[PDB]
Design a protein around this ligand. Structure first.
Ligand SMILES: Nc1ncnc2c1ncn2[C@@H]1O[C@H](COP(=O)(O)OP(=O)(O)O)[C@@H](O)[C@H]1O
Ligand SMILES: Nc1ncnc2c1ncn2[C@@H]1O[C@H](COP(=O)(O)OP(=O)(O)O)[C@@H](O)[C@H]1O
Ligand SMILES: Nc1ncnc2c1ncn2[C@@H]1O[C@H](COP(=O)(O)OP(=O)(O)O)[C@@H](O)[C@H]1O
Ligand SMILES: Nc1ncnc2c1ncn2[C@@H]1O[C@H](COP(=O)(O)OP(=O)(O)O)[C@@H](O)[C@H]1O
Lengths: 408, 408, 408, 408
């Protein structure tokens, strides 16, 4: 099982989300206040109430990714539903118990794929027993010693080591089979047709169910755009409603679905958004109060950037190096470009409109349009990417405001 | 069977709902005016009419939880439907006899789980007879005495006491089975595949039907916002209708459904909401008359809070201690912080807007942000949470109006 | 079969609907004009046309209950559809052939339950044959005399009389069974599992069908709010439409449904409502003319009340006595309170708004809030409820207008 | 497997999309920034993010066809969804994860047909073994040599060469068969009933899944008309939402589907449209940031046309020749008509409104009305289509503005 202490939770955070400590902090305080529970009895296993979180602040500084990530290391199943959607001011038809239904549909194509390296390496030593079986059969009547089985190997395990270097031969092996095929096929087959025997009844469900149930985490994005305070950001309280609908979810219900009936009850909720338009004080009271833990995030810096450009472990930048290396190019970003790199983000974000950390992403892939293209030429060649570089393909762009409008 | 006297019903209320005596009172007066019925004949079993309840008052002072709980000890099935919902001013598609429909779908995953420690302990002694049977068979032809049965036990009840300390052996027992498995599995199985023989035909229905039918209790929240008198709380009498739709439910009909045909006729209804917009006199007559018993509730006090902070048996505050302890921290709340604890909620509720008892929930989880976080360090350490404490992390917050607007 | 002469029909009416004679009158004249038909041939069995009724008048004086009841003694299946509904000015989706579909869904959970005391007392003498069968078996090879069967009873019918006073023993009796249970269970079982053998193929349908088909009665409430005459009570003739849709029903069609295809044709219709807004002259002509029989009702009196308070056979008042007795309380209403009781209704209904007979209901349950609560104390005690009583808990209430607004 | 280098990707473009080099370029830069990924590990296989593309420019100059084709040689599965669609301002019901859903439903009737000349020529040699088997059976007990198998052929491979010139005989061969048919049938059958044994379990899915997944490419057409800045191209931010909905798709989710559960995460997206109404800077941030790579296209020239008229490998013009030949007409276009051919499109596009390259298509099929009709007469006759020609059937048309409005 998972847990992690408060700080532990944080620290893996600072691994991919620069700054906003306060932020992290809370979310972890929610995720232990979580664990804690379990460890009680039955009374209070069921009278204490997922400490759901309200995420006030500007855009692109990481409310989402703070959640997204928290959850990945919780190893919780997770989904982010935009608040908008349930509005349909195009007037369609939106039901909110859907949300829970998709927090299962990952809670699966999550259980699945998170079962093919736990039970994959367990059955490449079971797809071999099925070819060292057709090239040379362990002659009828095994005289039980389990050590006269590694004794077929007296040539059998000479073919076992010869499966990795010489294949493409015509063979046929044992709703079963009885089929005559070929070996590089078949090798790619059995595998598949073997994960099946790696039992998938009321296990990939029931426990996938447990998934959601135990908990993930839903991040209800934008909540603020669904509540009133008049003028420009009120049509009707034909939005107020979606706060209502919502309630139950957060406030605790069962729900109908596909793989099994699910209990929202204990699910964790993380409600986002910026409120230049209203004020959290402005939710329906009901909601207001299921959002116990409130926290601010604040806009990142120039530095903050620079640092997001490199101190993220998946770093953007690196994404480059490696990507870029693949064509035979070392690439290497100075202190002093990683400086302008940011520097631009910030200047651009300040003239057009500011989209968050977001800009770096675009500013970059643009830096490289040159390199990133010609790359397969540079076969070995290496390049120095630095201020003086940067500014040559940037400055006038960033310069041209109205271009940036289009193309950054 | 249940009943309880008027006062009995009450006194279990005051167990988790401070004050509002008048409230309780009524509700209980409904819940016997209920029983009484039964005890009559056939004439008046079917000519007297569940004494439905109109819950006029402010928000977060207990209308819901008064119902909610009433029902829990009625051991009735219960659902709270928000009135809004049937409106869809986004225009979707709402049918209202849905309401009754879900009052059944808990009337079940309520009959269910409330049938697995009644009939659970009855068949842990029936899943053993199914293993003390495969380890050592009571040899062919039992010479009837029922006392040469505890006489297989001359070694059989030596394996019965040895089922609690040594398992994981490879065994196979008797749309039946004929299946070769193992014993920590199989133990977790049989149980399940045994609650089946614990007959679940026209019983887990029929009587679940009675449930609803005999009753639970539907709490139609907000009734007030579905009724007209003009200006800012009338769009059209395109809400009028919801009252209309509803009608029947309360006014007495059959409804179509999944596990069986239900009759709404005698279910109990408790219709909530505040009416600063209209006035109960403003329901359609038909309804109006179906909300016979009328009651007011009154906004809780500073004291009332203080008392909610502690005199609730699930106490908030306690939730802490015990939640908090789990990290190795005794926590203790003075009289005199529970004082400011309240003191605050009240002062905040009076400056932004007042959400009810609701605020404590929020004000608190905020007190603790410190404690609740650092907690895993305080391994043993104990803390004294008291006025002087409170005010250090509160006073300026509460101070800062416009913050509180966000973060309480 | 049913019929009843005109007056007969009336008289059972005056049993629970004080006054409005004219009203009754008609409805019965419809219900014989009904019978009459059948008694003709084939020509005129199918050229004469259910004499459907238009029920003009104020609210709460009994259009509905005049119908509701008429039908119960017709023993017709019956439903009251609000006219509103099909409007959806929230814009959903309403189809009108639904109506007929629910006039079947009772025409069932009516046929059903009206078959378990016709065939219940027929099979408690068939669930015994199944226990006096397991406690002492009628030894192999019955030597046919039918009078050596009451001759097992030479001890068998000593256990038959002993089934009513000594049970809870462990027995097992004969998609059948083969099951080992216990006797207070099983007794509650067999019954159920025996109504099944009380044949339920193409009988509980086909004749339930006959139900509707033969006839009940639909009371289309409010019809007037679905027709035009401009100003405050016309949006569009986007309501006119529902008169249209409707037509066929009343005017004669088949309809698709669940248990069987149904023919509206001969169904009886009773169309309600008050027309302060328009005038019956104001229906679509088509409708106008399927509402042959027109009748007024007029608002009830003070007396009328008083009399509804006692001369109804299910009397309200009595509802009290008996309900109230159950806790050990005789209760007894004077001439002279039953006077004020009413007196209030009337005064209240005249200040706030007047809801019909409806008020009594509420005025009362309020009278008793005192008694109705403390009742379980009065264990024997008896009380005199009379003017001087009444006015002590009423007068100021009725006084306070604006309270009454809420709580009467 | 595919890849191709940046330039390689390009050069096959310039094969059917004259000019717009910059365009191509990018797109290719995406389609390697794609490959590269794969070649990394697991960390960065799943932390780098398909480099999605924003296609700013005028209409009919190639955005679509640049994508369309890109994908064809990527041999990716592809779909272009119009942004409009999800709007329904007629108000229907649009879900957007539909988009992904259809990117699968070609990802298939693409895997399918692209599996019947790979495995088609593999089993025309397997449907013969099934007739050289009924005409002359390889007599019981094959004495294993695999060279006394081509030795049935001592008359058997005399019937194998005689299957191409003499058929229609009455034969019967081996949920199998046992059926008595005939041989030109049966030949057209077996084939089919043989692509089945060419295994189609969790292969025609799973890998079709990969398709989408590894990728095709969705081209979200017109993105611009789903975003706000006011006046004539904003109704509400009841379009805003479409951007919202979309999000996830591009921003990374699982989607439910027919042949299997798909992950959108890594698919490639290329979002089109012109922005004379807004400005790419005007997308919701979230999106904005997911359109990393930005590119412009520029309206083609007279020349560019001329060159589209011919330098396309499928050439329009050629379409003619060959289409036209089929009637017995060589046709030949001078340099100097292909000149006016273009010359015209350009002059028309500048007077009515300019639809892009689009016009040639129309201008042409009009040139020909004459030829294209009379063609079946010109049996041999050959024609010289050239300026002086062109202008005889064009000049006054192009002349007549308001005609062209109708008829080009
Ligand atoms: N504080 C930050 N530290 C690291 N990365 C960040 C930070 N803020 C934003 N980002 C990155 O830039 C984009 C913004 O993140 P996201 O969480 O979706 O923004 P927001 O929640 O603020 O709307 C993502 O690519 C995100 O991973
Ligand atoms: N007066 C009450 N007595 C005890 N707790 C209350 C009371 N009113 C509100 N609460 C608390 O705050 C929450 C609000 O109760 P609720 O019944 O949902 O309020 P309301 O009906 O007024 O909307 C509950 O969880 C409960 O603990
Ligand atoms: N004339 C009357 N005689 C007896 N009871 C009446 C009378 N009028 C109304 N009631 C009773 O008071 C309420 C009004 O009846 P209902 O038929 O639904 O009113 P309406 O049809 O006039 O809208 C019901 O409880 C009804 O049974
Ligand atoms: N610049 C281009 N190069 C070659 N053909 C083009 C070009 N632009 C448009 N066309 C032709 O006219 C049609 C329009 O191409 P399309 O990609 O659909 O234009 P757009 O994206 O600008 O809407 C295509 O069938 C193609 O033959």
């Amino acid at each position: 099982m998972s847990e992690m202490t408060p700080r532990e939770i944080v620290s893996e955070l600072d691994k991919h989300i620069i700054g906003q400590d306060n932020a992290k902090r809370s979310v972890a305080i929610a995720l232990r206040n979580r664990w804690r529970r379990m460890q009680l009895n039955e009374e209070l296993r069921h009278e204490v109430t997922p400490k759901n979180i309200l995420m006030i602040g500007p855009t692109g500084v990481g409310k989402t990714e703070i959640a997204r990530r928290l959850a990945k290391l919780a190893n919780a199943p997770f989904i982010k539903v935009e608040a908008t959607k349930f509005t349909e001011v195009g007037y369609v038809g939106k039901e909110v118990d859907s949300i829970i239904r998709d927090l299962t549909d990952a809670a699966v194509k999550m259980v699945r794929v998170q079962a093919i390296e736990k039970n994959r390496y367990r059955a490449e030593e079971l797809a071999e027993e099925r070819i060292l079986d057709v090239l040379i059969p362990p002659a009828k009547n095994n005289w039980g010693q389990t050590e006269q089985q590694q004794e077929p190997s007296a040539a059998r395990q000479a073919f076992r080591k010869k499966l990795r270097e010489g294949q493409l031969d015509d063979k046929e092996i044992e709703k079963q089979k009885a089929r005559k095929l070929k070996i590089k096929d078949a090798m790619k087959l059995l595998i598949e047709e073997e994960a099946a025997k790696l039992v998938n009844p009321e296990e990939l469900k029931q426990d996938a169910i447990d998934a959601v149930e135990q908990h993930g985490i839903v991040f209800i994005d934008e909540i603020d755009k669904i509540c009133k305070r008049g003028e420009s950001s009120g049509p009707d309280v034909s939005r107020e409603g979606v706060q209502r609908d919502l309630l139950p979810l957060v406030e605790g219900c069962t729900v109908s679905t596909k793989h099994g009936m699910v209990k929202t009850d204990h699910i964790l909720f993380i409600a986002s958004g910026a409120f230049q338009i209203a004020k959290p004080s402005d939710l329906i009271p009901e909601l207001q109060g299921r959002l116990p833990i409130r926290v601010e995030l604040q806009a990142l810096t120039t530095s903050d950037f620079e640092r997001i450009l490199t101190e993220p472990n998946a770093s953007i930048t690196v994404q480059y190096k490696a990507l870029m290396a693949t064509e035979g190019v070392n690439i290497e970003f100075t202190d002093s470009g990683i400086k302008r790199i940011a520097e631009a983000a910030w200047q651009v974000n300040e003239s057009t409109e500011n989209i968050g950390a977001r800009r770096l992403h675009t500013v970059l892939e643009r830096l490289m349009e040159e390199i990133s293209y010609d790359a397969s030429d540079l076969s070995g060649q290496n390049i120095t990417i630095d201020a003086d570089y940067v500014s040559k393909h940037l400055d006038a762009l960033v310069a041209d405001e109205d271009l940036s409008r289009f193309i950054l």
